[PDB]
Amino acid sequence: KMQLNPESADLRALAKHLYDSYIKSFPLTKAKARAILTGKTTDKSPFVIYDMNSLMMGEDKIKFKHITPLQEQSKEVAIRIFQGCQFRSVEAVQEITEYAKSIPGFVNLDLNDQVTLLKYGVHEIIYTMLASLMNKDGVLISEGQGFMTREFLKSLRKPFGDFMEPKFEFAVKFNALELDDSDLAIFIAVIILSGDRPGLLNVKPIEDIQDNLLQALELQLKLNHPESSQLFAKLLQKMTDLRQIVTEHVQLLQVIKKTETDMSLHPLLQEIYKDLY
Ligand SMILES: Cc1c(C)n(Cc2ccc(Cl)c(O[C@@H](C)C(=O)O)c2)c2ccc(C(=O)N[C@@H](C)c3ccc(C(C)(C)C)cc3)cc12
Numbered sequence: 510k511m512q513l514n515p516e517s518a519d520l521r522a523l524a525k526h527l528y529d530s531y532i533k534s535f536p537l538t539k540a541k542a543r544a545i546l547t548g549k550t551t552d553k554s555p556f557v558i559y560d561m562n563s564l565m566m567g568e569d570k571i572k573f574k575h576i577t578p579l580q581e582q583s584k585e586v587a588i589r590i591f592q593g594c595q596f597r598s599v600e601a602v603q604e605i606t607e608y609a610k611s612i613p614g615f616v617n618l619d620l621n622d623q624v625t626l627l628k629y630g631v632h633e634i635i636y637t638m639l640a641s642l643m644n645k646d647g648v649l650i651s652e653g654q655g656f657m658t659r660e661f662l663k664s665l666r667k668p669f670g671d672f673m674e675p676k677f678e679f680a681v682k683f684n685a686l687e688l689d690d691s692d693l694a695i696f697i698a699v700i701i702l703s704g705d706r707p708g709l710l711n712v713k714p715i716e717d718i719q720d721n722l723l724q725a726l727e728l729q730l731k732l733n734h735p736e737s738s739q740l741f742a743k744l745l746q747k748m749t750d751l752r753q754i755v756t757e758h759v760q761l762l763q764v765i766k767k768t769e770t771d772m773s774l775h776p777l778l779q780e781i782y783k784d785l786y
């Protein structure tokens with residue numbers, strides 16, 4: 510229908526509010542990420558890691574040194590890279606949670622339901638925003654200061670050689686939608702307010718917030734993408750694809766968390782690296 514009625518102005522105002530929260534909560538947006546991947550930005554080119562020799566030069570640019578070099582160099586590299594991917598994941602939760610609080614009505618929910626929505630929703634947000642940082646060659650790492658190639662990640666040890674491939678194959682199909690930060694801001698909020706998470710108390714207040722986010726998203730996509738019909742429908746299938754692809758990812762590293770013995774990082778040691786930095 511698309512009318513210029515007072516309810517549409519509220520859906521446009523909600524999109525503006527979610528976008529402003531998207532900028533403050535997340536440092537590296539897709540707008541700046543694409544500027545680095547194409548060299549359009551005035552900043553310096555990021556350090557590129559494509560082989561083992563380039564990775565050794567990258568570690569020398571880090572203040573930390575890792576004073577426990579295990580003999581297995583195939584494990585010294587794979588395990589070290591994976592824990593860098595996990596320490597960054599923890600800081601993303603701090604940013605995701607900061608953005609989740611900005612969604613109208615989220616704080617008014619039950620506190621245990623807020624945990625449940627973030628519990629199962631953090632992974633699906635990571636999969637989405639990670640696509641903004643990667644292309645067909647590699648992924649931007651360390652707040653855009655680095656760039657690790659895709660084929661280098663495939664050259665790691667056999668268990669760690671394909672934990673990023675399910676994310677690259679999703680990105681090439683998700684970036685084809687060519688969404689911008691304005692579209693992603695609403696789309697992230699829709700994933701959080703998914704009212705069918707296992708263990709939700711009152712589903713009624715959650716889906717009521719999501720239905721306004723869904724209406725604000727379809728209005729955003731129809732206005733921002735004039736040459737793309739059914740883009741709202743295509744994006745819903747990408748959301749359901751995140752469901753069955755995250756369950757395969759969470760079950761994948763549970764084998765690593767158990768068979769590597771040193772993967773479940775010590776809780777008190779985590780907080781030391783966060784507060785020092
Ligand atoms: C492998 C890898 C990936 C895929 N990424 C991007 C990434 C990951 C996870 C999420 Cl969730 C994510 O999501 C986006 C949307 C976001 O949040 O930007 C984006 C990395 C970022 C930094 C480092 C690293 O190793 N960096 C060095 C500088 C360091 C960091 C920390 C340490 C200590 C453990 C000692 C503290 C030591 C060295 C490695 C990776």
Ligand SMILES: Cc1c(C)n(Cc2ccc(Cl)c(O[C@@H](C)C(=O)O)c2)c2ccc(C(=O)N[C@@H](C)c3ccc(C(C)(C)C)cc3)cc12
Pocket residue numbers: 556567568570571573574575576577588589590592593650651654655656771
């Ligand atoms: C020094 C260091 C430490 C202490 N950790 C945590 C860590 C290591 C090893 C084990 Cl085993 C571990 O687990 C338990 C058992 C433990 O020993 O504490 C925990 C790191 C993780 C990743 C990188 C890295 O080199 N990340 C690469 C991807 C990059 C990223 C970004 C850059 C630039 C910023 C220059 C762009 C350069 C290189 C370095 C370190």
